[PDB]
Paper text:
We recently described a panel of TCRs that recognize a public neoantigen resulting from a hotspot mutation in the phosphoinositide 3-kinase p110α catalytic subunit (PI3Kα, encoded by the gene [name]) that is presented by [name]*03:01 ([name]-A3). The neoantigen results from the substitution of leucine for histidine at the first primary anchor (position 2; sequence AHHGGWTTK → ALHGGWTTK). The mutation enhances peptide binding to [name]-A3, and the neoantigen drives T cell destruction of mutant tumors while leaving tumor cells producing wild-type PI3Kα unharmed. We show that [name] discrimination between the PI3Kα neoantigen and WT peptide results from dynamic allostery, in particular how the identity of the position 2 anchor influences motions within the peptide/[name]-A3 complex that in turn either block (for the WT peptide) or facilitate (for the neoantigen) a dramatic peptide conformational change that is required for [name] binding.
We thus designed an experiment to directly probe the importance of the pTrp6 flip in the neoantigen. The tryptophan analog 3-benzothienyl-L-alanine (Bta) is isomorphic with tryptophan but replaces the indole nitrogen with a sulfur atom incapable of serving as a hydrogen bond donor. We reasoned that removing the hydrogen bond donor would destabilize the [name]-bound flipped peptide conformation, with a destabilized conformation resulting in weaker [name] binding. At the same time, removing the hydrogen bond donor by substituting pTrp6 with Bta should have little to no impact on the [name]-free peptide conformation, as in the neoantigen/[name]-A3 structure, the side chain at position 6 remains accessible to solvent. We verified that substitution of pTrp6 with Bta did not impact the binding of the peptide to [name]-A3 using differential scanning fluorimetry: as expected, there was no impact on the stability of the peptide/[name]-A3 complex. We next determined the crystallographic structure of [name]-A3 presenting the Bta-substituted peptide. The structure showed there were no significant changes in peptide conformation, with the Bta6 side chain aligned against the [name]-A3 α1 helix and the sulfur atom solvent exposed, mimicking the conformation of the neoantigen. Using SPR we could not detect binding of TCR4 or TCR3 to the complex of [name]-A3 with the Bta-substituted neoantigen, although this complex was readily recognized by the s3-4 scTv positive control. Functionally, the Bta-substituted neoantigen also failed to drive cytokine secretion by T cells transduced with TCR3 or TCR4 when co-cultured with [name]-A3+ antigen presenting cells, although the unmodified neoantigen control was well-recognized. [name] recognition of the PI3Kα neoantigen is thus critically dependent on the flip of pTrp6.
Numbering used by the authors:
A (entry chain B): 1 to 99
B (entry chain C): 1 to 9
C (entry chain A): 1 to 274
């Protein structure tokens, strides 16, 4: 009846420190549609974050893409924080360059 | 373009 | 190749918090071109692709009226289906609708579809003949009898195999230059030790369109879908897609594994080895 979101955090182009890129948090496979997604820089919420319009897959589960432009520095830590009814605590997925 | 027809359930 | 036009609708009841949230999106292939959000300031159908912006105000007038009528129909249906399923007026519920048509590269009609859901489960669907309905349970059979009597399938068919195809053909011509073509996948492999004795081999595919793709791992001919980790295909945000697949292998036996990639922009199935 209720399906928990799958979370992927990744960049659009291959990461290269100092070069402007796009940080993506793709959330999919969830139901119901109400969801909170925040992108984080060193633990703090990036304020200007855009997201796609709500859509769904053949199994009726929803998906959304949250994105913002970021200039990666090797010291900066980025993550996606997601809250959903299926979750007790908000899930944080850190950005890994190899995934 | 959208469909312009509506039948309620 | 083939093309599609699809409209997606979601209505979510907000008990005691106003009218239901309504979000509608139109796609040609995997490219969104229109949107409507009941919580947005415009209260109009809005363009989301460059080639649709050339449409005149009479187009946006008709699309705004028709999408609002769909939202008002869903308002009724949210209350009606709450009664069919004997549910309280206090919970939030969801109606989802998808319909559209496919055409061939010659523009000929291939298939039309319409499917409705309630709380994320099948409710009623139009059959591929565009003449009969399939209800998922006895509650949805109430809707089917009402639609069979009103001959709803006949008017809907006239759209799905007629008007839908008409507009899709026009969109494909208006956006022929910038419509995402078959962009082939850029492929590579990476190697990540997890211990002194094992390592993760990851097979990458980036910047491809359309989204359909197949990535598999073989170990000396045999398959290993069980020990393979496959992520869902994901949007890059620029119009292209990404996907990877990984397998954990013993250190020294990496040559015994092959990744295989399949896309429509690949003349032959690519095969990779570390």
């Amino acid at each position: 009846i209720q399906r928990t979101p799958k979370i992927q955090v990744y960049s659009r182009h291959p990461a290269e420190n100092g070069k402007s890129n796009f940080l993506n948090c793709y959330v999919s496979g969830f139901h119901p549609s109400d969801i909170e997604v925040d992108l984080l820089k060193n633990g703090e919420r990036i304020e200007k974050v855009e997201h796609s319009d709500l859509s769904f897959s053949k199994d009726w589960s929803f998906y959304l893409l949250y994105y913002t432009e970021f200039t990666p520095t090797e010291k900066d830590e980025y993550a996606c924080r997601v809250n959903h009814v299926t979750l007790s605590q908000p899930k944080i997925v850190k950005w890994d360059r190899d995934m | 373009a959208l469909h312009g027809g509506w039948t309620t359930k | 190749g083939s093309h599609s036009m699809r409209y997606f609708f979601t209505s979510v009841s907000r008990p005691g918090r106003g009218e239901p949230r309504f979000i509608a999106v139109g796609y040609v292939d995997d490219t969104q071109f229109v949107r409507f959000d009941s919580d947005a300031a415009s209260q109009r159908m809005e363009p989301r692709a460059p080639w649709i912006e050339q449409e005149g105000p009479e187009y946006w007038d008709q699309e705004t009226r028709n999408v609002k009528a769909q939202s008002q129909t869903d308002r009724v249906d949210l209350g009606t289906l709450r009664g069919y399923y004997n549910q309280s007026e206090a919970g939030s519920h969801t109606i989802q609708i998808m319909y559209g048509c496919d055409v061939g590269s010659d523009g000929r009609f291939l298939r039309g579809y319409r499917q409705d859901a309630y709380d994320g489960k099948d409710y009623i669907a139009l059959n591929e003949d565009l003449r009969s309905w399939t209800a998922a349970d006895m509650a949805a059979q109430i809707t089917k009898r009402k639609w069979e009597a009103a001959h709803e399938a006949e008017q809907l068919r006239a759209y799905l195999d007629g008007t839908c195809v008409e507009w899709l053909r026009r969109y494909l011509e208006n956006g022929k230059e910038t419509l995402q073509r078959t962009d082939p996948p850029k492929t590579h492999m990476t190697h990540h030790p997890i211990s002194d004795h094992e390592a993760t081999l990851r097979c990458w595919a980036l910047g491809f369109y359309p989204a359909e793709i197949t990535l598999t791992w073989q170990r000396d001919g045999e398959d290993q879908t069980q020990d393979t980790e496959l992520v869902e295909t994901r949007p890059a945000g620029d119009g292209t897609f990404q996907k990877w697949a990984a397998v954990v292998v013993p250190s020294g036996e990496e040559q015994r594994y092959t990744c295989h990639v399949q896309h429509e922009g690949l003349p032959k199935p690519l095969t990779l080895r570390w």
